[PDB]
Tab-separated table of C-alpha atoms and ligand atoms in Angstrom:
chain	number	residue	atom	x	y	z
A	268	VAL	CA	86.933	109.080	79.220
A	269	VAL	CA	89.956	111.255	78.133
A	270	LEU	CA	92.403	110.266	75.313
A	271	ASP	CA	96.151	111.092	74.960
A	272	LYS	CA	98.434	111.757	71.910
A	273	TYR	CA	102.161	111.611	73.000
A	274	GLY	CA	100.967	112.199	76.625
A	275	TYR	CA	98.779	115.325	76.070
A	276	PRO	CA	94.886	115.285	76.452
A	277	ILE	CA	93.472	115.683	72.912
A	278	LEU	CA	89.865	114.335	73.021
A	279	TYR	CA	87.136	112.378	74.866
A	280	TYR	CA	79.029	119.881	65.533
A	281	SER	CA	80.344	122.658	63.213
A	282	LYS	CA	83.829	124.269	63.090
A	283	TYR	CA	82.494	127.638	61.655
A	284	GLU	CA	83.796	126.693	58.129
A	285	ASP	CA	80.708	128.407	56.564
A	286	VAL	CA	81.288	131.701	58.554
A	287	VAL	CA	82.229	134.476	56.086
A	288	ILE	CA	82.038	138.156	57.186
A	289	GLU	CA	83.060	140.738	54.570
A	290	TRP	CA	84.058	144.381	55.271
A	291	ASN	CA	81.318	147.096	54.970
A	292	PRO	CA	82.087	149.242	51.823
A	293	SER	CA	80.145	152.239	53.334
A	294	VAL	CA	82.873	152.477	56.036
A	295	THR	CA	86.369	153.544	54.863
A	296	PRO	CA	89.240	152.778	57.315
A	297	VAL	CA	91.388	155.776	58.381
A	298	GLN	CA	94.880	155.313	56.873
A	299	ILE	CA	97.218	155.196	59.910
A	300	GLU	CA	100.825	153.894	59.944
A	301	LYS	CA	100.899	150.734	62.065
A	302	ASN	CA	103.535	151.379	64.786
A	303	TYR	CA	103.755	148.141	66.846
A	304	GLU	CA	106.461	146.033	68.512
A	305	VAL	CA	106.516	143.016	70.875
A	306	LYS	CA	108.693	144.818	73.531
A	307	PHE	CA	108.783	141.619	75.622
A	308	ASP	CA	108.143	137.920	74.925
A	309	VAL	CA	109.218	134.831	77.011
A	310	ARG	CA	110.907	133.327	73.851
A	311	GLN	CA	113.375	136.312	73.678
A	312	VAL	CA	115.574	134.666	76.419
A	313	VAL	CA	120.361	121.235	93.422
A	314	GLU	CA	117.282	123.278	94.513
A	315	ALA	CA	114.794	123.640	91.590
A	316	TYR	CA	113.536	127.129	92.569
A	317	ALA	CA	116.854	128.542	93.964
A	318	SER	CA	117.647	130.389	90.664
A	319	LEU	CA	114.043	131.680	90.383
A	320	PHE	CA	114.003	133.270	93.888
A	321	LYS	CA	117.537	134.691	93.351
A	322	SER	CA	116.217	136.317	90.081
A	323	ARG	CA	112.925	137.573	91.725
A	324	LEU	CA	114.765	139.115	94.736
A	325	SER	CA	117.470	140.704	92.499
A	326	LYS	CA	114.864	142.250	90.090
A	327	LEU	CA	112.410	143.587	92.719
A	328	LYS	CA	115.258	144.791	95.068
A	329	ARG	CA	116.343	146.987	92.051
A	330	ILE	CA	112.774	148.456	91.759
A	331	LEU	CA	112.643	149.142	95.566
A	332	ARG	CA	116.114	150.849	95.460
A	333	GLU	CA	114.631	153.271	92.858
A	334	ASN	CA	112.404	154.732	95.665
A	335	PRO	CA	114.308	157.800	97.067
A	336	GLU	CA	112.806	157.134	100.552
A	337	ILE	CA	114.572	153.707	100.753
A	338	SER	CA	118.047	154.210	102.306
A	339	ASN	CA	120.496	152.539	104.740
A	340	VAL	CA	119.821	149.025	103.367
A	341	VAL	CA	121.555	146.299	105.442
A	342	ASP	CA	121.915	142.544	104.895
A	343	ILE	CA	119.572	140.382	107.018
A	344	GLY	CA	122.593	138.147	107.886
A	345	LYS	CA	124.338	141.205	109.413
A	346	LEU	CA	121.327	142.347	111.574
A	347	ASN	CA	122.894	141.558	115.005
A	348	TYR	CA	126.242	143.206	114.221
A	349	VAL	CA	123.930	146.273	114.127
A	350	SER	CA	123.190	147.992	117.473
A	351	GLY	CA	119.513	148.494	118.494
A	352	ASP	CA	119.971	152.303	118.153
A	353	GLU	CA	120.353	152.345	114.320
A	354	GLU	CA	117.301	152.661	112.035
A	355	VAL	CA	117.956	150.356	109.052
A	356	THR	CA	116.107	149.048	105.971
A	357	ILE	CA	115.984	145.385	104.945
A	358	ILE	CA	114.835	144.062	101.517
A	359	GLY	CA	113.641	140.476	101.218
A	360	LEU	CA	111.089	137.850	100.207
A	361	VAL	CA	108.000	137.398	102.421
A	362	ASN	CA	108.534	133.689	103.356
A	363	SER	CA	105.645	133.633	105.894
A	364	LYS	CA	102.990	136.104	107.170
A	365	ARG	CA	100.944	135.631	110.415
A	366	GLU	CA	98.485	137.981	112.219
A	367	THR	CA	98.338	138.388	116.028
A	368	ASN	CA	96.002	140.800	117.928
A	369	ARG	CA	99.195	142.889	118.517
A	370	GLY	CA	100.135	143.213	114.772
A	371	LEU	CA	101.788	141.307	111.850
A	372	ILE	CA	104.625	138.716	112.012
A	373	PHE	CA	106.660	138.241	108.811
A	374	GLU	CA	109.516	135.838	108.082
A	375	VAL	CA	111.639	137.931	105.665
A	376	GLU	CA	114.521	136.357	103.694
A	377	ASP	CA	117.356	137.876	101.615
A	378	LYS	CA	120.557	136.392	100.063
A	379	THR	CA	122.427	136.577	103.452
A	380	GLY	CA	119.801	135.316	105.930
A	381	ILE	CA	116.279	135.090	107.455
A	382	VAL	CA	114.659	137.332	110.161
A	383	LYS	CA	111.328	137.660	112.119
A	384	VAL	CA	109.769	141.091	111.406
A	385	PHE	CA	107.057	142.663	113.591
A	386	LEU	CA	104.825	145.539	112.344
A	387	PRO	CA	102.573	147.144	115.058
A	388	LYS	CA	98.687	146.950	114.747
A	389	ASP	CA	98.442	150.480	113.373
A	390	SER	CA	101.673	151.625	111.738
A	391	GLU	CA	100.337	153.934	108.927
A	392	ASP	CA	101.572	151.316	106.323
A	393	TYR	CA	99.581	148.421	107.991
A	394	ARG	CA	96.733	148.367	105.398
A	395	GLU	CA	99.348	147.558	102.691
A	396	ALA	CA	101.358	145.070	104.805
A	397	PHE	CA	98.049	143.328	105.591
A	398	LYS	CA	97.413	142.958	101.826
A	399	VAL	CA	100.909	141.785	100.682
A	400	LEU	CA	100.997	138.197	99.318
A	401	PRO	CA	103.691	135.683	100.440
A	402	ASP	CA	106.808	135.242	98.208
A	403	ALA	CA	106.513	138.941	97.189
A	404	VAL	CA	109.635	141.156	97.676
A	405	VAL	CA	109.208	144.003	100.207
A	406	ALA	CA	111.243	146.489	102.311
A	407	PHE	CA	111.040	147.226	106.068
A	408	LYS	CA	112.479	150.247	107.920
A	409	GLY	CA	112.964	149.777	111.677
A	410	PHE	CA	115.218	148.602	114.538
A	411	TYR	CA	116.594	145.180	115.582
A	412	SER	CA	115.660	143.933	119.139
A	413	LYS	CA	118.684	141.561	119.752
A	414	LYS	CA	116.044	138.981	120.976
A	415	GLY	CA	115.590	138.006	117.259
A	416	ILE	CA	112.850	140.397	116.071
A	417	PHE	CA	113.003	143.356	113.636
A	418	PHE	CA	110.656	146.020	115.058
A	419	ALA	CA	109.605	147.727	111.816
A	420	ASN	CA	107.962	151.191	111.778
A	421	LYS	CA	107.651	151.411	107.940
A	422	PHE	CA	106.642	148.974	105.143
A	423	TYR	CA	107.474	149.459	101.409
A	424	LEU	CA	106.249	147.870	98.165
A	425	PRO	CA	108.096	148.007	94.772
A	426	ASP	CA	105.006	150.099	93.552
A	427	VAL	CA	104.817	152.367	90.398
A	428	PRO	CA	106.297	155.945	90.291
A	429	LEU	CA	103.809	158.668	91.314
A	430	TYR	CA	105.376	160.988	88.666
A	431	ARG	CA	106.106	159.895	85.053
A	432	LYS	CA	106.575	162.208	81.979
A	433	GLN	CA	103.556	162.494	79.605
A	434	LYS	CA	103.931	160.980	76.112
A	435	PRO	CA	103.814	163.068	72.876
A	436	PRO	CA	100.444	163.066	70.992
A	437	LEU	CA	99.897	160.804	67.952
A	438	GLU	CA	99.271	162.118	64.368
A	439	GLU	CA	95.992	160.151	64.287
A	440	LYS	CA	93.568	158.642	66.826
A	441	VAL	CA	94.016	154.846	66.957
A	442	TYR	CA	91.996	152.242	68.886
A	443	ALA	CA	92.826	148.810	70.352
A	444	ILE	CA	90.183	146.141	71.173
A	445	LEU	CA	90.776	143.912	74.245
A	446	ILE	CA	89.222	140.425	74.393
A	447	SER	CA	89.977	137.143	76.283
A	448	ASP	CA	88.428	133.862	77.511
A	449	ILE	CA	86.637	133.045	74.243
A	450	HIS	CA	86.405	129.343	75.334
A	451	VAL	CA	85.633	127.929	71.844
A	452	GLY	CA	84.408	124.328	72.303
A	453	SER	CA	82.184	125.093	75.309
A	454	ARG	CA	78.371	124.862	75.029
A	455	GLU	CA	78.347	128.120	77.046
A	456	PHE	CA	80.366	129.989	74.369
A	457	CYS	CA	78.319	133.024	73.265
A	458	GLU	CA	78.515	132.049	69.569
A	459	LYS	CA	75.977	134.615	68.233
A	460	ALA	CA	77.408	137.439	70.409
A	461	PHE	CA	80.936	136.743	69.067
A	462	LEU	CA	79.678	136.615	65.432
A	463	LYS	CA	77.967	140.025	66.028
A	464	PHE	CA	81.333	141.304	67.409
A	465	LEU	CA	83.105	140.132	64.206
A	466	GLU	CA	80.369	141.982	62.200
A	467	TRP	CA	80.990	145.135	64.363
A	468	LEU	CA	84.788	144.834	63.612
A	469	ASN	CA	83.970	144.658	59.850
A	470	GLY	CA	82.172	148.052	59.910
A	471	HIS	CA	78.662	146.620	60.454
A	472	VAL	CA	77.746	149.289	63.073
A	473	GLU	CA	74.528	151.372	63.339
A	474	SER	CA	75.857	154.716	64.756
A	475	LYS	CA	78.279	157.431	63.468
A	476	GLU	CA	80.305	157.356	66.737
A	477	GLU	CA	80.867	153.559	66.325
A	478	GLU	CA	81.741	154.175	62.623
A	479	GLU	CA	84.546	156.615	63.561
A	480	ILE	CA	85.859	154.051	66.148
A	481	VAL	CA	85.786	150.988	63.727
A	482	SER	CA	87.655	153.033	61.031
A	483	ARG	CA	90.445	153.703	63.603
A	484	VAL	CA	90.656	150.143	65.139
A	485	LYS	CA	94.067	148.667	64.177
A	486	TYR	CA	94.770	146.224	67.067
A	487	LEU	CA	93.037	143.232	68.731
A	488	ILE	CA	94.601	141.684	71.864
A	489	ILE	CA	93.485	138.212	73.060
A	490	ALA	CA	94.635	137.441	76.676
A	491	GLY	CA	94.188	133.653	76.958
A	492	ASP	CA	91.644	130.797	77.181
A	493	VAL	CA	90.968	131.124	73.429
A	494	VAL	CA	89.671	127.487	73.477
A	495	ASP	CA	87.873	125.609	76.350
A	496	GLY	CA	90.455	122.797	76.251
A	497	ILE	CA	90.338	119.094	77.205
A	498	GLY	CA	90.558	117.616	80.722
A	499	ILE	CA	90.854	121.043	82.452
A	500	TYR	CA	88.492	119.921	85.279
A	501	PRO	CA	86.558	116.655	86.033
A	502	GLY	CA	83.197	116.570	84.244
A	503	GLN	CA	84.245	119.100	81.532
A	504	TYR	CA	83.024	116.612	78.819
A	505	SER	CA	79.393	117.326	79.889
A	506	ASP	CA	79.915	120.997	78.782
A	507	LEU	CA	81.862	120.405	75.530
A	508	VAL	CA	80.181	120.829	72.138
A	509	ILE	CA	83.634	120.369	70.425
A	510	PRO	CA	85.319	117.570	72.500
A	511	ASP	CA	88.561	117.649	70.429
A	512	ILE	CA	91.530	120.074	70.991
A	513	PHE	CA	92.501	120.158	67.229
A	514	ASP	CA	88.896	120.925	66.222
A	515	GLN	CA	88.691	123.652	68.924
A	516	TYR	CA	91.670	125.584	67.393
A	517	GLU	CA	90.345	124.962	63.870
A	518	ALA	CA	86.892	126.369	64.866
A	519	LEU	CA	88.584	129.372	66.551
A	520	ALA	CA	90.841	130.125	63.515
A	521	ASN	CA	87.776	129.944	61.187
A	522	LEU	CA	86.125	132.685	63.293
A	523	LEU	CA	89.335	134.799	63.659
A	524	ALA	CA	89.903	134.539	59.846
A	525	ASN	CA	86.918	136.963	59.621
A	526	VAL	CA	88.905	139.703	61.491
A	527	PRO	CA	89.738	142.590	59.024
A	528	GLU	CA	93.244	142.501	57.397
A	529	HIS	CA	93.946	146.082	58.628
A	530	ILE	CA	93.688	144.756	62.250
A	531	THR	CA	96.796	143.150	63.819
A	532	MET	CA	95.820	140.375	66.263
A	533	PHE	CA	98.024	139.530	69.261
A	534	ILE	CA	97.073	136.071	70.630
A	535	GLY	CA	98.346	134.806	73.990
A	536	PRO	CA	97.666	131.505	75.840
A	537	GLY	CA	95.686	130.832	79.047
A	538	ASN	CA	95.339	127.824	81.418
A	539	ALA	CA	92.635	126.079	79.203
A	540	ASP	CA	94.872	126.370	76.116
A	541	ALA	CA	97.218	123.808	74.511
A	542	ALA	CA	100.267	125.444	76.110
A	543	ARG	CA	102.787	124.828	78.936
A	544	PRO	CA	100.979	123.604	82.139
A	545	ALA	CA	102.913	126.203	84.245
A	546	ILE	CA	103.563	129.983	84.019
A	547	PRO	CA	105.232	131.638	82.085
A	548	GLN	CA	103.822	130.071	78.886
A	549	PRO	CA	106.243	130.795	76.009
A	550	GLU	CA	103.476	130.332	73.354
A	551	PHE	CA	100.888	127.697	72.269
A	552	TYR	CA	101.783	124.061	71.481
A	553	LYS	CA	102.095	124.368	67.634
A	554	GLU	CA	100.979	120.693	67.127
A	555	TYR	CA	97.464	121.479	68.514
A	556	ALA	CA	97.220	125.291	67.957
A	557	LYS	CA	98.608	125.357	64.314
A	558	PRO	CA	95.378	126.879	62.697
A	559	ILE	CA	95.782	130.204	64.614
A	560	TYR	CA	99.559	130.345	63.761
A	561	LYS	CA	98.513	130.343	60.042
A	562	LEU	CA	96.257	133.480	60.267
A	563	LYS	CA	97.750	136.224	58.001
A	564	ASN	CA	97.128	139.098	60.491
A	565	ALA	CA	97.924	137.199	63.751
A	566	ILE	CA	101.004	137.391	66.018
A	567	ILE	CA	101.312	134.656	68.667
A	568	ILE	CA	102.512	136.260	71.906
A	569	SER	CA	103.686	134.611	75.166
A	570	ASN	CA	101.954	134.642	78.600
A	571	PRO	CA	103.036	137.208	79.815
A	572	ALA	CA	103.961	139.620	76.978
A	573	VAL	CA	104.525	143.415	76.573
A	574	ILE	CA	103.217	144.987	73.323
A	575	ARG	CA	104.388	148.526	72.505
A	576	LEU	CA	101.678	150.194	70.373
A	577	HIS	CA	102.588	153.715	69.116
A	578	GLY	CA	105.055	154.124	72.037
A	579	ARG	CA	102.580	152.835	74.687
A	580	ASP	CA	103.394	149.676	76.692
A	581	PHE	CA	100.558	147.126	76.982
A	582	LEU	CA	101.401	144.333	79.462
A	583	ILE	CA	99.297	141.248	78.556
A	584	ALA	CA	98.902	138.377	81.076
A	585	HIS	CA	96.176	135.727	81.464
A	586	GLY	CA	95.365	136.662	85.065
A	587	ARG	CA	96.261	133.641	87.249
A	588	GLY	CA	97.559	136.074	89.902
A	589	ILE	CA	94.065	137.615	90.453
A	590	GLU	CA	93.045	134.238	92.041
A	591	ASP	CA	96.083	134.421	94.416
A	592	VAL	CA	94.972	137.908	95.601
A	593	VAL	CA	91.265	136.974	96.165
A	594	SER	CA	92.245	133.826	98.216
A	595	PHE	CA	94.946	135.483	100.385
A	596	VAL	CA	93.349	138.967	100.815
A	597	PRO	CA	89.976	139.051	102.689
A	598	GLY	CA	87.764	141.861	101.412
A	599	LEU	CA	89.176	141.630	97.877
A	600	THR	CA	87.074	139.409	95.545
A	601	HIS	CA	85.927	138.953	91.892
A	602	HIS	CA	82.835	141.100	90.715
A	603	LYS	CA	85.659	143.676	90.819
A	604	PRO	CA	89.047	142.126	89.600
A	605	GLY	CA	90.341	145.749	89.253
A	606	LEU	CA	91.512	146.044	92.903
A	607	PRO	CA	93.286	142.579	92.959
A	608	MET	CA	95.044	143.672	89.675
A	609	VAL	CA	96.235	146.927	91.417
A	610	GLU	CA	97.865	144.761	94.153
A	611	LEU	CA	99.831	142.758	91.518
A	612	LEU	CA	100.993	146.051	89.923
A	613	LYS	CA	102.052	147.394	93.397
A	614	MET	CA	103.967	144.118	94.116
A	615	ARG	CA	105.400	144.361	90.539
A	616	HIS	CA	104.785	140.599	90.136
A	617	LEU	CA	102.007	138.851	88.146
A	618	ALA	CA	101.730	135.709	90.351
A	619	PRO	CA	103.983	135.822	93.457
A	620	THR	CA	102.158	133.106	95.513
A	621	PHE	CA	103.343	129.449	95.292
A	622	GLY	CA	101.183	126.339	95.716
A	623	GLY	CA	97.787	127.314	94.257
A	624	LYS	CA	96.145	125.684	91.228
A	625	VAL	CA	98.634	128.406	89.836
A	626	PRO	CA	101.645	126.315	88.684
A	627	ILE	CA	104.822	128.442	88.733
A	628	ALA	CA	107.682	127.024	86.635
A	629	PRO	CA	111.100	126.647	88.360
A	630	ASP	CA	112.769	128.668	85.557
A	631	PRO	CA	116.311	130.276	85.782
A	632	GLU	CA	114.994	133.866	85.558
A	633	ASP	CA	111.718	135.219	87.000
A	634	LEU	CA	109.856	136.481	83.924
A	635	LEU	CA	106.698	137.191	86.028
A	636	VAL	CA	108.339	140.322	87.604
A	637	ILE	CA	106.856	143.537	86.061
A	638	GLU	CA	110.419	144.888	85.341
A	639	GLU	CA	109.194	148.031	83.589
A	640	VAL	CA	106.198	150.290	84.272
A	641	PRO	CA	103.390	149.643	81.729
A	642	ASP	CA	100.819	152.173	80.483
A	643	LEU	CA	98.091	149.456	80.431
A	644	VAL	CA	97.755	145.998	82.072
A	645	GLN	CA	95.317	143.581	80.394
A	646	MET	CA	94.217	140.372	82.136
A	647	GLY	CA	91.516	137.768	81.563
A	648	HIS	CA	90.963	134.491	83.482
A	649	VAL	CA	88.333	135.677	86.085
A	650	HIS	CA	85.561	136.245	83.403
A	651	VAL	CA	84.443	139.578	84.981
A	652	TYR	CA	84.943	142.970	83.314
A	653	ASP	CA	86.553	145.826	85.308
A	654	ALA	CA	88.759	148.877	84.651
A	655	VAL	CA	90.619	151.049	87.194
A	656	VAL	CA	93.468	153.607	86.932
A	657	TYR	CA	96.344	153.412	89.483
A	658	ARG	CA	99.087	156.114	89.211
A	659	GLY	CA	98.474	156.667	85.452
A	660	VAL	CA	98.393	152.885	84.734
A	661	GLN	CA	95.154	151.441	83.295
A	662	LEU	CA	94.258	148.047	84.861
A	663	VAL	CA	91.607	146.264	82.756
A	664	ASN	CA	89.972	142.789	82.728
A	665	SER	CA	88.709	141.909	79.189
A	666	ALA	CA	86.035	139.499	80.660
A	667	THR	CA	84.863	136.437	78.592
A	668	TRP	CA	82.736	135.129	75.679
A	669	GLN	CA	81.579	132.215	77.903
A	670	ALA	CA	78.248	132.234	79.830
A	671	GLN	CA	77.992	130.675	83.343
A	672	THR	CA	78.908	126.972	83.193
A	673	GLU	CA	77.640	124.231	85.597
A	674	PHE	CA	81.113	124.254	87.308
A	675	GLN	CA	81.221	128.089	87.579
A	676	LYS	CA	77.743	128.040	89.300
A	677	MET	CA	79.125	125.480	91.844
A	678	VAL	CA	82.325	127.474	92.647
A	679	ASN	CA	80.223	130.710	92.728
A	680	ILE	CA	81.827	132.400	89.622
A	681	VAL	CA	79.360	134.918	88.056
A	682	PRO	CA	80.695	136.025	84.632
A	683	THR	CA	80.010	139.242	82.670
A	684	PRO	CA	80.075	137.811	79.088
A	685	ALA	CA	80.416	139.838	75.851
A	686	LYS	CA	81.738	143.090	77.462
A	687	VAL	CA	84.508	144.464	75.176
A	688	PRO	CA	86.903	147.263	76.368
A	689	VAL	CA	87.717	149.868	73.647
A	690	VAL	CA	91.188	151.376	74.289
A	691	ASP	CA	92.461	154.750	72.997
A	692	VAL	CA	96.172	153.926	72.323
A	693	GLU	CA	97.257	157.632	72.808
A	694	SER	CA	96.115	157.857	76.469
A	695	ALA	CA	96.290	154.010	76.965
A	696	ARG	CA	92.770	154.214	78.492
A	697	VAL	CA	89.470	152.300	78.235
A	698	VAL	CA	87.187	154.942	76.609
A	699	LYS	CA	84.134	152.756	75.817
A	700	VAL	CA	82.794	149.258	76.629
A	701	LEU	CA	80.994	147.387	73.826
A	702	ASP	CA	78.095	145.342	75.240
A	703	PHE	CA	77.134	142.291	73.124
A	704	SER	CA	75.470	140.488	76.146
A	705	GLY	CA	71.999	141.004	74.597
A	706	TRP	CA	73.038	138.092	72.281
A	707	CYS	CA	73.608	135.814	75.373
B	1969	LIG	C1	87.322	128.273	83.006
B	1969	LIG	AS1	88.865	129.362	83.577
B	1969	LIG	C2	88.164	129.904	85.345
B	1969	LIG	O1	90.169	128.359	83.795
B	1969	LIG	O2	88.931	130.725	82.633
B	1970	LIG	FE1	88.750	131.423	81.035
B	1971	LIG	ZN1	91.763	130.995	82.726
């Protein structure tokens, strides 16, 4: 039985009040100038979705036009004023996508019209066109039939540039720790493993290599599902140790209060959090999440957000789009969220698909478009660790602190709890993975 305060689910144990972890005096932190900036945050800004699709198409059409190979772009509404002898390019939204034994049939839409696009079974770009999600913005080079079909010979994605200038080296080596899906309130929350991680952060390490990493750790990024929430799925009460949303954030803040003062924490919301029930999520609902807002070394970031650390762009998103990729693309699955994350980077959109459990807000501007090329992309949500480099961009899933729940077992989700990516800010790369799973 769920309860509501002003409409929101609030309720249906210890809150780590006693938890006190002090810094190890034996370890001295390396004195580095903290160079950080929230480069992008959601808060820095008839048909309900008309303005959103206009914004999405306009933004991604700009990214496609930056490809030197994309030329002779013509409006879809002008396609039969074009003779069948002229090779043209069209840019538009993938409205529909259907496979025949003879190839792929797309319904592509721009600001001027809609057209049926055919791509033959084995056009060298087929593998990519077979993977593209609907409501993504793509380009097609080909000829118009005059029967109503665009016979494409080439398919293009917004993508990331193959060549980008290397960044100047930093004065000192600085590390960033990536975590997500803590799920405080769940019986499956790896409580001891997380306490051992807080000890590790406070210089309580047993090797010299770890000691030189801990001394240089200045940033901690939390990519959503910081609490387990209330009424997220039917039967969730059976798994909750803390069945109160206020007490979940209070328990979380009591743990996060034990994060060293020299570490700047960037905390973003997820789908389990007391935040907007659609994406993008500006922040957390301050009425429920107040205890984390009061942490001295914490900065509440939006979902999505872009954090510039020492000149390196870290794009932080919860990871709702990984689900869209695994459902729509056969062959791609969890156990490896790295490849689905590459597809979102290539589409330059975090969650293009409409209709899923993935609620996309009918906002005026599409803030889910990856407008600028990041150095690192951090996502959570799927509860499986992975890391892959695509064209100099590090794609990384920060896993979870939650062991396999009853519900996860049923929907065949196999998590990799307590696996912590260690990021070298200079190269914006995962250099080590801390494994605290022995405590699970
Ligand atoms: C429990 As979940 C799959 O919403 O991180
Ligand atoms: Fe989660
Ligand atoms: Zn989630």
